[PDB]
PDB file of all heavy atoms in Angstrom:
ATOM      1  N   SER L 271    -113.469 -25.064  -8.276  1.00  0.00           N
ATOM      2  CA  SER L 271    -113.826 -25.424  -6.934  1.00  0.00           C
ATOM      3  C   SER L 271    -115.278 -25.707  -6.659  1.00  0.00           C
ATOM      4  O   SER L 271    -116.117 -25.222  -7.372  1.00  0.00           O
ATOM      5  CB  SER L 271    -113.344 -24.249  -5.972  1.00  0.00           C
ATOM      6  OG  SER L 271    -112.009 -24.010  -6.106  1.00  0.00           O
ATOM      7  N   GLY L 272    -115.527 -26.546  -5.675  1.00  0.00           N
ATOM      8  CA  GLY L 272    -116.814 -26.648  -5.073  1.00  0.00           C
ATOM      9  C   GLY L 272    -117.417 -28.095  -5.306  1.00  0.00           C
ATOM     10  O   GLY L 272    -116.847 -28.840  -6.023  1.00  0.00           O
ATOM     11  N   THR L 273    -118.565 -28.340  -4.648  1.00  0.00           N
ATOM     12  CA  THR L 273    -119.453 -29.458  -5.100  1.00  0.00           C
ATOM     13  C   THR L 273    -120.150 -28.999  -6.403  1.00  0.00           C
ATOM     14  O   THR L 273    -120.059 -27.949  -6.841  1.00  0.00           O
ATOM     15  CB  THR L 273    -120.298 -29.723  -3.927  1.00  0.00           C
ATOM     16  OG1 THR L 273    -121.272 -28.675  -3.712  1.00  0.00           O
ATOM     17  CG2 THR L 273    -119.649 -30.151  -2.663  1.00  0.00           C
ATOM     18  N   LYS L 274    -120.957 -29.945  -6.870  1.00  0.00           N
ATOM     19  CA  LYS L 274    -121.647 -29.708  -8.058  1.00  0.00           C
ATOM     20  C   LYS L 274    -122.782 -30.760  -8.256  1.00  0.00           C
ATOM     21  O   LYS L 274    -122.552 -31.946  -7.955  1.00  0.00           O
ATOM     22  CB  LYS L 274    -120.761 -29.640  -9.313  1.00  0.00           C
ATOM     23  CG  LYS L 274    -121.363 -29.516 -10.593  1.00  0.00           C
ATOM     24  CD  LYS L 274    -121.980 -28.096 -10.796  1.00  0.00           C
ATOM     25  CE  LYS L 274    -122.772 -27.944 -12.020  1.00  0.00           C
ATOM     26  NZ  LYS L 274    -123.415 -26.648 -12.156  1.00  0.00           N
ATOM     27  N   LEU L 275    -124.016 -30.291  -8.692  1.00  0.00           N
ATOM     28  CA  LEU L 275    -125.112 -31.202  -8.966  1.00  0.00           C
ATOM     29  C   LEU L 275    -124.846 -31.684 -10.423  1.00  0.00           C
ATOM     30  O   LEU L 275    -124.654 -30.916 -11.305  1.00  0.00           O
ATOM     31  CB  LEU L 275    -126.400 -30.450  -8.880  1.00  0.00           C
ATOM     32  CG  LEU L 275    -127.072 -30.341  -7.452  1.00  0.00           C
ATOM     33  CD1 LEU L 275    -128.278 -29.587  -7.533  1.00  0.00           C
ATOM     34  CD2 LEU L 275    -127.268 -31.713  -6.829  1.00  0.00           C
ATOM     35  N   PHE L 276    -125.031 -33.016 -10.647  1.00  0.00           N
ATOM     36  CA  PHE L 276    -124.822 -33.655 -11.903  1.00  0.00           C
ATOM     37  C   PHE L 276    -126.013 -34.422 -12.330  1.00  0.00           C
ATOM     38  O   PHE L 276    -126.393 -35.344 -11.638  1.00  0.00           O
ATOM     39  CB  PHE L 276    -123.589 -34.651 -11.701  1.00  0.00           C
ATOM     40  CG  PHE L 276    -122.240 -33.908 -11.674  1.00  0.00           C
ATOM     41  CD1 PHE L 276    -121.478 -34.018 -10.592  1.00  0.00           C
ATOM     42  CD2 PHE L 276    -121.737 -33.284 -12.751  1.00  0.00           C
ATOM     43  CE1 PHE L 276    -120.214 -33.431 -10.471  1.00  0.00           C
ATOM     44  CE2 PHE L 276    -120.599 -32.680 -12.810  1.00  0.00           C
ATOM     45  CZ  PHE L 276    -119.738 -32.805 -11.655  1.00  0.00           C
ATOM     46  N   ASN L 277    -126.525 -34.093 -13.447  1.00  0.00           N
ATOM     47  CA  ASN L 277    -127.603 -34.823 -14.140  1.00  0.00           C
ATOM     48  C   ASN L 277    -127.075 -35.717 -15.155  1.00  0.00           C
ATOM     49  O   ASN L 277    -126.095 -35.313 -15.877  1.00  0.00           O
ATOM     50  CB  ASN L 277    -128.639 -33.812 -14.734  1.00  0.00           C
ATOM     51  CG  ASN L 277    -129.123 -32.770 -13.828  1.00  0.00           C
ATOM     52  OD1 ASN L 277    -129.614 -33.018 -12.648  1.00  0.00           O
ATOM     53  ND2 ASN L 277    -128.846 -31.471 -14.059  1.00  0.00           N
ATOM     54  N   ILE L 278    -127.473 -36.964 -15.246  1.00  0.00           N
ATOM     55  CA  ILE L 278    -127.032 -37.988 -16.107  1.00  0.00           C
ATOM     56  C   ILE L 278    -128.157 -38.562 -16.810  1.00  0.00           C
ATOM     57  O   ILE L 278    -129.127 -39.041 -16.228  1.00  0.00           O
ATOM     58  CB  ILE L 278    -126.237 -39.105 -15.321  1.00  0.00           C
ATOM     59  CG1 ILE L 278    -125.014 -38.502 -14.635  1.00  0.00           C
ATOM     60  CG2 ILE L 278    -125.799 -40.178 -16.304  1.00  0.00           C
ATOM     61  CD1 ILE L 278    -124.522 -39.381 -13.491  1.00  0.00           C
ATOM     62  N   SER L 279    -128.154 -38.446 -18.195  1.00  0.00           N
ATOM     63  CA  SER L 279    -129.356 -38.674 -18.997  1.00  0.00           C
ATOM     64  C   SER L 279    -129.022 -39.594 -20.117  1.00  0.00           C
ATOM     65  O   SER L 279    -127.891 -39.440 -20.850  1.00  0.00           O
ATOM     66  CB  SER L 279    -129.865 -37.304 -19.506  1.00  0.00           C
ATOM     67  OG  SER L 279    -130.240 -36.510 -18.493  1.00  0.00           O
ATOM     68  N   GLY L 280    -129.888 -40.536 -20.379  1.00  0.00           N
ATOM     69  CA  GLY L 280    -129.788 -41.284 -21.717  1.00  0.00           C
ATOM     70  C   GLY L 280    -128.809 -42.351 -21.793  1.00  0.00           C
ATOM     71  O   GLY L 280    -127.678 -42.071 -21.441  1.00  0.00           O
ATOM     72  N   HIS L 281    -129.300 -43.460 -22.207  1.00  0.00           N
ATOM     73  CA  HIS L 281    -128.471 -44.601 -22.487  1.00  0.00           C
ATOM     74  C   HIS L 281    -127.510 -44.953 -21.305  1.00  0.00           C
ATOM     75  O   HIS L 281    -126.235 -44.813 -21.417  1.00  0.00           O
ATOM     76  CB  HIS L 281    -127.586 -44.418 -23.792  1.00  0.00           C
ATOM     77  CG  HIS L 281    -128.433 -44.488 -25.057  1.00  0.00           C
ATOM     78  ND1 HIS L 281    -129.508 -45.200 -25.116  1.00  0.00           N
ATOM     79  CD2 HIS L 281    -128.217 -43.970 -26.287  1.00  0.00           C
ATOM     80  CE1 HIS L 281    -130.067 -45.106 -26.358  1.00  0.00           C
ATOM     81  NE2 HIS L 281    -129.286 -44.232 -27.104  1.00  0.00           N
ATOM     82  N   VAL L 282    -128.099 -45.165 -20.149  1.00  0.00           N
ATOM     83  CA  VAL L 282    -127.431 -45.765 -19.044  1.00  0.00           C
ATOM     84  C   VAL L 282    -128.520 -46.401 -18.161  1.00  0.00           C
ATOM     85  O   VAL L 282    -129.654 -46.055 -18.164  1.00  0.00           O
ATOM     86  CB  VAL L 282    -126.610 -44.508 -18.290  1.00  0.00           C
ATOM     87  CG1 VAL L 282    -127.576 -43.542 -17.863  1.00  0.00           C
ATOM     88  CG2 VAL L 282    -125.762 -45.089 -17.213  1.00  0.00           C
ATOM     89  N   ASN L 283    -128.056 -47.271 -17.290  1.00  0.00           N
ATOM     90  CA  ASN L 283    -128.967 -48.162 -16.591  1.00  0.00           C
ATOM     91  C   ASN L 283    -129.804 -47.345 -15.528  1.00  0.00           C
ATOM     92  O   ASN L 283    -131.026 -47.779 -15.311  1.00  0.00           O
ATOM     93  CB  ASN L 283    -128.184 -49.342 -15.905  1.00  0.00           C
ATOM     94  CG  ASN L 283    -127.188 -50.029 -16.780  1.00  0.00           C
ATOM     95  OD1 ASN L 283    -126.169 -50.421 -16.353  1.00  0.00           O
ATOM     96  ND2 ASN L 283    -127.587 -50.111 -18.021  1.00  0.00           N
ATOM     97  N   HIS L 284    -129.287 -46.325 -15.000  1.00  0.00           N
ATOM     98  CA  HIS L 284    -130.005 -45.597 -13.880  1.00  0.00           C
ATOM     99  C   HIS L 284    -129.691 -44.052 -14.065  1.00  0.00           C
ATOM    100  O   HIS L 284    -128.925 -43.554 -13.331  1.00  0.00           O
ATOM    101  CB  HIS L 284    -129.481 -46.138 -12.542  1.00  0.00           C
ATOM    102  CG  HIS L 284    -129.650 -47.529 -12.267  1.00  0.00           C
ATOM    103  ND1 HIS L 284    -130.900 -48.150 -12.742  1.00  0.00           N
ATOM    104  CD2 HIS L 284    -128.981 -48.532 -11.677  1.00  0.00           C
ATOM    105  CE1 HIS L 284    -130.758 -49.498 -12.372  1.00  0.00           C
ATOM    106  NE2 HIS L 284    -129.613 -49.652 -11.800  1.00  0.00           N
ATOM    107  N   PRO L 285    -130.421 -43.423 -15.002  1.00  0.00           N
ATOM    108  CA  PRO L 285    -130.306 -41.988 -15.024  1.00  0.00           C
ATOM    109  C   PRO L 285    -130.838 -41.352 -13.841  1.00  0.00           C
ATOM    110  O   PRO L 285    -131.910 -41.593 -13.406  1.00  0.00           O
ATOM    111  CB  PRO L 285    -131.108 -41.638 -16.299  1.00  0.00           C
ATOM    112  CG  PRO L 285    -132.077 -42.796 -16.447  1.00  0.00           C
ATOM    113  CD  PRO L 285    -131.390 -43.999 -15.929  1.00  0.00           C
ATOM    114  N   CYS L 286    -129.967 -40.384 -13.280  1.00  0.00           N
ATOM    115  CA  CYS L 286    -130.314 -39.774 -12.054  1.00  0.00           C
ATOM    116  C   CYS L 286    -129.662 -38.441 -11.948  1.00  0.00           C
ATOM    117  O   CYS L 286    -128.859 -37.977 -12.881  1.00  0.00           O
ATOM    118  CB  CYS L 286    -129.714 -40.611 -10.785  1.00  0.00           C
ATOM    119  SG  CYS L 286    -128.010 -41.094 -10.932  1.00  0.00           S
ATOM    120  N   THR L 287    -130.023 -37.669 -10.907  1.00  0.00           N
ATOM    121  CA  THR L 287    -129.395 -36.426 -10.546  1.00  0.00           C
ATOM    122  C   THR L 287    -128.592 -36.679  -9.294  1.00  0.00           C
ATOM    123  O   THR L 287    -129.193 -37.168  -8.268  1.00  0.00           O
ATOM    124  CB  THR L 287    -130.354 -35.262 -10.386  1.00  0.00           C
ATOM    125  OG1 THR L 287    -130.942 -34.998 -11.760  1.00  0.00           O
ATOM    126  CG2 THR L 287    -129.700 -33.970  -9.832  1.00  0.00           C
ATOM    127  N   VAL L 288    -127.346 -36.235  -9.234  1.00  0.00           N
ATOM    128  CA  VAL L 288    -126.404 -36.521  -8.064  1.00  0.00           C
ATOM    129  C   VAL L 288    -125.556 -35.321  -7.788  1.00  0.00           C
ATOM    130  O   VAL L 288    -125.088 -34.597  -8.759  1.00  0.00           O
ATOM    131  CB  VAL L 288    -125.629 -37.764  -8.440  1.00  0.00           C
ATOM    132  CG1 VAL L 288    -124.478 -37.954  -7.396  1.00  0.00           C
ATOM    133  CG2 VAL L 288    -126.449 -39.062  -8.629  1.00  0.00           C
ATOM    134  N   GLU L 289    -125.321 -35.129  -6.585  1.00  0.00           N
ATOM    135  CA  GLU L 289    -124.311 -34.176  -6.050  1.00  0.00           C
ATOM    136  C   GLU L 289    -123.005 -34.968  -5.965  1.00  0.00           C
ATOM    137  O   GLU L 289    -122.906 -36.090  -5.551  1.00  0.00           O
ATOM    138  CB  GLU L 289    -124.673 -33.536  -4.722  1.00  0.00           C
ATOM    139  CG  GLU L 289    -123.827 -32.265  -4.478  1.00  0.00           C
ATOM    140  CD  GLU L 289    -123.877 -31.937  -2.860  1.00  0.00           C
ATOM    141  OE1 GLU L 289    -124.820 -32.367  -2.245  1.00  0.00           O
ATOM    142  OE2 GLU L 289    -122.903 -31.296  -2.467  1.00  0.00           O
ATOM    143  N   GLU L 290    -121.962 -34.333  -6.446  1.00  0.00           N
ATOM    144  CA  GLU L 290    -120.551 -34.991  -6.496  1.00  0.00           C
ATOM    145  C   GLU L 290    -119.495 -33.827  -6.483  1.00  0.00           C
ATOM    146  O   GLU L 290    -119.771 -32.674  -6.862  1.00  0.00           O
ATOM    147  CB  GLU L 290    -120.498 -35.857  -7.690  1.00  0.00           C
ATOM    148  CG  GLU L 290    -119.521 -37.029  -7.507  1.00  0.00           C
ATOM    149  CD  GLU L 290    -119.916 -38.011  -6.367  1.00  0.00           C
ATOM    150  OE1 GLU L 290    -121.021 -37.916  -5.747  1.00  0.00           O
ATOM    151  OE2 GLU L 290    -119.043 -38.927  -6.047  1.00  0.00           O
ATOM    152  N   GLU L 291    -118.337 -34.332  -6.241  1.00  0.00           N
ATOM    153  CA  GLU L 291    -117.159 -33.430  -6.117  1.00  0.00           C
ATOM    154  C   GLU L 291    -116.657 -32.896  -7.469  1.00  0.00           C
ATOM    155  O   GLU L 291    -116.548 -33.816  -8.397  1.00  0.00           O
ATOM    156  CB  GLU L 291    -116.041 -34.124  -5.377  1.00  0.00           C
ATOM    157  CG  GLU L 291    -115.076 -33.248  -4.647  1.00  0.00           C
ATOM    158  CD  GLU L 291    -113.897 -32.798  -5.556  1.00  0.00           C
ATOM    159  OE1 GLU L 291    -113.351 -33.742  -6.260  1.00  0.00           O
ATOM    160  OE2 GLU L 291    -113.341 -31.611  -5.455  1.00  0.00           O
ATOM    161  N   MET L 292    -116.408 -31.710  -7.651  1.00  0.00           N
ATOM    162  CA  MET L 292    -115.979 -31.073  -8.868  1.00  0.00           C
ATOM    163  C   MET L 292    -114.545 -31.745  -9.212  1.00  0.00           C
ATOM    164  O   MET L 292    -113.828 -32.060  -8.323  1.00  0.00           O
ATOM    165  CB  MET L 292    -115.930 -29.609  -8.840  1.00  0.00           C
ATOM    166  CG  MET L 292    -115.270 -28.857  -9.996  1.00  0.00           C
ATOM    167  SD  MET L 292    -115.759 -27.171 -10.013  1.00  0.00           S
ATOM    168  CE  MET L 292    -117.250 -27.192 -11.016  1.00  0.00           C
ATOM    169  N   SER L 293    -114.255 -31.783 -10.529  1.00  0.00           N
ATOM    170  CA  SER L 293    -113.118 -32.399 -11.026  1.00  0.00           C
ATOM    171  C   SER L 293    -113.051 -33.878 -10.906  1.00  0.00           C
ATOM    172  O   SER L 293    -112.065 -34.487 -11.039  1.00  0.00           O
ATOM    173  CB  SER L 293    -111.815 -31.767 -10.423  1.00  0.00           C
ATOM    174  OG  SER L 293    -110.606 -32.162 -11.133  1.00  0.00           O
ATOM    175  N   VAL L 294    -114.228 -34.455 -10.632  1.00  0.00           N
ATOM    176  CA  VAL L 294    -114.357 -35.904 -10.621  1.00  0.00           C
ATOM    177  C   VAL L 294    -114.185 -36.447 -11.975  1.00  0.00           C
ATOM    178  O   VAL L 294    -114.475 -35.690 -13.022  1.00  0.00           O
ATOM    179  CB  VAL L 294    -115.760 -36.327 -10.125  1.00  0.00           C
ATOM    180  CG1 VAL L 294    -116.864 -35.769 -10.844  1.00  0.00           C
ATOM    181  CG2 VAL L 294    -115.882 -37.836 -10.142  1.00  0.00           C
ATOM    182  N   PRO L 295    -113.566 -37.627 -12.272  1.00  0.00           N
ATOM    183  CA  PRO L 295    -113.579 -38.115 -13.648  1.00  0.00           C
ATOM    184  C   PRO L 295    -114.945 -38.545 -14.062  1.00  0.00           C
ATOM    185  O   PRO L 295    -115.607 -39.244 -13.315  1.00  0.00           O
ATOM    186  CB  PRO L 295    -112.546 -39.235 -13.589  1.00  0.00           C
ATOM    187  CG  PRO L 295    -111.822 -39.071 -12.371  1.00  0.00           C
ATOM    188  CD  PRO L 295    -112.785 -38.391 -11.396  1.00  0.00           C
ATOM    189  N   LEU L 296    -115.240 -38.311 -15.325  1.00  0.00           N
ATOM    190  CA  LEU L 296    -116.595 -38.763 -15.797  1.00  0.00           C
ATOM    191  C   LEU L 296    -116.804 -40.214 -15.861  1.00  0.00           C
ATOM    192  O   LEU L 296    -117.939 -40.678 -15.595  1.00  0.00           O
ATOM    193  CB  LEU L 296    -116.741 -38.100 -17.282  1.00  0.00           C
ATOM    194  CG  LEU L 296    -117.961 -38.549 -18.109  1.00  0.00           C
ATOM    195  CD1 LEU L 296    -119.216 -38.245 -17.371  1.00  0.00           C
ATOM    196  CD2 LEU L 296    -117.899 -37.872 -19.452  1.00  0.00           C
ATOM    197  N   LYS L 297    -115.745 -40.958 -16.134  1.00  0.00           N
ATOM    198  CA  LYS L 297    -115.986 -42.374 -16.022  1.00  0.00           C
ATOM    199  C   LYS L 297    -116.256 -42.908 -14.575  1.00  0.00           C
ATOM    200  O   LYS L 297    -117.194 -43.756 -14.429  1.00  0.00           O
ATOM    201  CB  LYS L 297    -114.676 -43.056 -16.413  1.00  0.00           C
ATOM    202  CG  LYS L 297    -114.805 -44.618 -16.798  1.00  0.00           C
ATOM    203  CD  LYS L 297    -113.416 -45.271 -17.063  1.00  0.00           C
ATOM    204  CE  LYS L 297    -113.562 -46.742 -17.383  1.00  0.00           C
ATOM    205  NZ  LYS L 297    -112.309 -47.434 -17.029  1.00  0.00           N
ATOM    206  N   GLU L 298    -115.674 -42.382 -13.572  1.00  0.00           N
ATOM    207  CA  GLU L 298    -116.089 -42.526 -12.265  1.00  0.00           C
ATOM    208  C   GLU L 298    -117.524 -42.174 -11.989  1.00  0.00           C
ATOM    209  O   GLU L 298    -118.324 -42.852 -11.385  1.00  0.00           O
ATOM    210  CB  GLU L 298    -115.148 -41.825 -11.264  1.00  0.00           C
ATOM    211  CG  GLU L 298    -113.709 -42.279 -11.323  1.00  0.00           C
ATOM    212  CD  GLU L 298    -113.111 -42.387  -9.960  1.00  0.00           C
ATOM    213  OE1 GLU L 298    -113.354 -41.485  -9.083  1.00  0.00           O
ATOM    214  OE2 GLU L 298    -112.198 -43.267  -9.802  1.00  0.00           O
ATOM    215  N   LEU L 299    -117.844 -40.951 -12.668  1.00  0.00           N
ATOM    216  CA  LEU L 299    -119.174 -40.437 -12.515  1.00  0.00           C
ATOM    217  C   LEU L 299    -120.348 -41.364 -12.974  1.00  0.00           C
ATOM    218  O   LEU L 299    -121.330 -41.464 -12.418  1.00  0.00           O
ATOM    219  CB  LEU L 299    -119.252 -39.093 -13.269  1.00  0.00           C
ATOM    220  CG  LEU L 299    -120.294 -38.095 -12.829  1.00  0.00           C
ATOM    221  CD1 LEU L 299    -119.826 -37.291 -11.575  1.00  0.00           C
ATOM    222  CD2 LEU L 299    -120.627 -37.179 -14.025  1.00  0.00           C
ATOM    223  N   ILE L 300    -119.999 -42.055 -14.082  1.00  0.00           N
ATOM    224  CA  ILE L 300    -121.060 -42.968 -14.614  1.00  0.00           C
ATOM    225  C   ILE L 300    -120.957 -44.364 -14.079  1.00  0.00           C
ATOM    226  O   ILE L 300    -121.976 -45.077 -14.059  1.00  0.00           O
ATOM    227  CB  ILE L 300    -120.916 -42.956 -16.225  1.00  0.00           C
ATOM    228  CG1 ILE L 300    -121.386 -41.632 -16.807  1.00  0.00           C
ATOM    229  CG2 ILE L 300    -121.836 -43.944 -16.831  1.00  0.00           C
ATOM    230  CD1 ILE L 300    -120.588 -41.262 -18.051  1.00  0.00           C
ATOM    231  N   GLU L 301    -119.813 -44.852 -13.694  1.00  0.00           N
ATOM    232  CA  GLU L 301    -119.641 -46.175 -13.174  1.00  0.00           C
ATOM    233  C   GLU L 301    -120.194 -46.159 -11.719  1.00  0.00           C
ATOM    234  O   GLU L 301    -121.104 -46.992 -11.430  1.00  0.00           O
ATOM    235  CB  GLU L 301    -118.171 -46.708 -13.173  1.00  0.00           C
ATOM    236  CG  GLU L 301    -117.685 -46.847 -14.610  1.00  0.00           C
ATOM    237  CD  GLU L 301    -118.369 -48.007 -15.254  1.00  0.00           C
ATOM    238  OE1 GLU L 301    -118.864 -48.892 -14.533  1.00  0.00           O
ATOM    239  OE2 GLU L 301    -118.349 -48.022 -16.451  1.00  0.00           O
ATOM    240  N   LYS L 302    -119.752 -45.310 -10.797  1.00  0.00           N
ATOM    241  CA  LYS L 302    -120.229 -45.266  -9.392  1.00  0.00           C
ATOM    242  C   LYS L 302    -121.644 -44.939  -9.381  1.00  0.00           C
ATOM    243  O   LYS L 302    -122.581 -45.776  -9.033  1.00  0.00           O
ATOM    244  CB  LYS L 302    -119.451 -44.274  -8.614  1.00  0.00           C
ATOM    245  CG  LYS L 302    -118.028 -44.647  -8.307  1.00  0.00           C
ATOM    246  CD  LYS L 302    -117.446 -43.708  -7.290  1.00  0.00           C
ATOM    247  CE  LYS L 302    -115.985 -43.509  -7.471  1.00  0.00           C
ATOM    248  NZ  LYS L 302    -115.227 -44.765  -7.844  1.00  0.00           N
ATOM    249  N   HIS L 303    -121.977 -43.668  -9.829  1.00  0.00           N
ATOM    250  CA  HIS L 303    -123.364 -43.344  -9.921  1.00  0.00           C
ATOM    251  C   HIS L 303    -123.945 -43.571 -11.362  1.00  0.00           C
ATOM    252  O   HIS L 303    -123.162 -43.355 -12.342  1.00  0.00           O
ATOM    253  CB  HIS L 303    -123.565 -41.767  -9.662  1.00  0.00           C
ATOM    254  CG  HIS L 303    -123.233 -41.470  -8.129  1.00  0.00           C
ATOM    255  ND1 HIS L 303    -122.025 -40.745  -7.896  1.00  0.00           N
ATOM    256  CD2 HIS L 303    -123.835 -41.812  -6.991  1.00  0.00           C
ATOM    257  CE1 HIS L 303    -122.040 -40.592  -6.504  1.00  0.00           C
ATOM    258  NE2 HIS L 303    -123.152 -41.191  -5.918  1.00  0.00           N
ATOM    259  N   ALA L 304    -125.230 -43.911 -11.415  1.00  0.00           N
ATOM    260  CA  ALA L 304    -125.859 -44.191 -12.727  1.00  0.00           C
ATOM    261  C   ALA L 304    -125.147 -45.268 -13.455  1.00  0.00           C
ATOM    262  O   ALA L 304    -124.561 -45.076 -14.453  1.00  0.00           O
ATOM    263  CB  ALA L 304    -125.912 -42.887 -13.564  1.00  0.00           C
ATOM    264  N   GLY L 305    -125.185 -46.489 -12.911  1.00  0.00           N
ATOM    265  CA  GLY L 305    -124.539 -47.667 -13.245  1.00  0.00           C
ATOM    266  C   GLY L 305    -124.344 -47.821 -14.689  1.00  0.00           C
ATOM    267  O   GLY L 305    -125.106 -47.440 -15.563  1.00  0.00           O
ATOM    268  N   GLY L 306    -123.139 -48.468 -15.122  1.00  0.00           N
ATOM    269  CA  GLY L 306    -122.493 -48.180 -16.446  1.00  0.00           C
ATOM    270  C   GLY L 306    -123.412 -48.249 -17.649  1.00  0.00           C
ATOM    271  O   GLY L 306    -124.499 -48.856 -17.569  1.00  0.00           O
ATOM    272  N   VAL L 307    -122.909 -47.637 -18.732  1.00  0.00           N
ATOM    273  CA  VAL L 307    -123.810 -47.427 -19.876  1.00  0.00           C
ATOM    274  C   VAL L 307    -124.317 -48.682 -20.427  1.00  0.00           C
ATOM    275  O   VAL L 307    -123.802 -49.739 -20.256  1.00  0.00           O
ATOM    276  CB  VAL L 307    -123.013 -46.536 -20.941  1.00  0.00           C
ATOM    277  CG1 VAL L 307    -122.423 -45.324 -20.287  1.00  0.00           C
ATOM    278  CG2 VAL L 307    -122.028 -47.372 -21.670  1.00  0.00           C
ATOM    279  N   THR L 308    -125.494 -48.491 -21.306  1.00  0.00           N
ATOM    280  CA  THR L 308    -126.154 -49.665 -21.711  1.00  0.00           C
ATOM    281  C   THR L 308    -125.246 -50.424 -22.741  1.00  0.00           C
ATOM    282  O   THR L 308    -124.720 -49.882 -23.703  1.00  0.00           O
ATOM    283  CB  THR L 308    -127.395 -49.169 -22.570  1.00  0.00           C
ATOM    284  OG1 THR L 308    -126.983 -48.264 -23.571  1.00  0.00           O
ATOM    285  CG2 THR L 308    -128.331 -48.549 -21.502  1.00  0.00           C
ATOM    286  N   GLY L 309    -124.964 -51.712 -22.446  1.00  0.00           N
ATOM    287  CA  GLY L 309    -123.891 -52.445 -23.024  1.00  0.00           C
ATOM    288  C   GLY L 309    -122.523 -52.143 -22.469  1.00  0.00           C
ATOM    289  O   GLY L 309    -121.517 -52.638 -23.096  1.00  0.00           O
ATOM    290  N   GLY L 310    -122.481 -51.514 -21.373  1.00  0.00           N
ATOM    291  CA  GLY L 310    -121.188 -51.206 -20.759  1.00  0.00           C
ATOM    292  C   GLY L 310    -120.343 -50.321 -21.539  1.00  0.00           C
ATOM    293  O   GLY L 310    -120.714 -49.758 -22.605  1.00  0.00           O
ATOM    294  N   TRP L 311    -119.078 -50.222 -21.078  1.00  0.00           N
ATOM    295  CA  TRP L 311    -118.093 -49.353 -21.863  1.00  0.00           C
ATOM    296  C   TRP L 311    -117.763 -49.928 -23.198  1.00  0.00           C
ATOM    297  O   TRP L 311    -117.186 -49.178 -23.954  1.00  0.00           O
ATOM    298  CB  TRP L 311    -116.775 -49.196 -20.943  1.00  0.00           C
ATOM    299  CG  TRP L 311    -116.084 -47.899 -21.187  1.00  0.00           C
ATOM    300  CD1 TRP L 311    -114.953 -47.745 -21.797  1.00  0.00           C
ATOM    301  CD2 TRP L 311    -116.570 -46.687 -20.661  1.00  0.00           C
ATOM    302  NE1 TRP L 311    -114.576 -46.280 -21.690  1.00  0.00           N
ATOM    303  CE2 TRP L 311    -115.598 -45.725 -21.024  1.00  0.00           C
ATOM    304  CE3 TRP L 311    -117.714 -46.225 -19.869  1.00  0.00           C
ATOM    305  CZ2 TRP L 311    -115.727 -44.393 -20.737  1.00  0.00           C
ATOM    306  CZ3 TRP L 311    -117.783 -44.944 -19.593  1.00  0.00           C
ATOM    307  CH2 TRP L 311    -116.857 -44.090 -19.936  1.00  0.00           C
TER     308      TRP L 311
END
């Protein structure tokens, strides 16, 4: 349960720290926030 702060690091266009809903899928996490990985999926 709960919200959660999410740090996203390394090999992605926009590494950031983001608050987001727990049990979010990681693919959504990287596509929506911190635009998709270098060279895409």
Side-chain angles (χ1 to χ4, degrees):
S271 304
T273 64
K274 178 66 186 175
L275 278 178
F276 282 116
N277 310 302
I278 297 162
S279 299
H281 287 336
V282 64
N283 311 143
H284 301 321
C286 52
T287 293
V288 174
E289 196 199 336
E290 206 62 7
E291 204 268 321
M292 174 162 271
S293 194
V294 56
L296 171 55
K297 194 188 183 209
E298 301 221 322
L299 204 81
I300 292 152
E301 292 294 334
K302 291 192 209 320
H303 294 114
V307 309
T308 57
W311 214 251

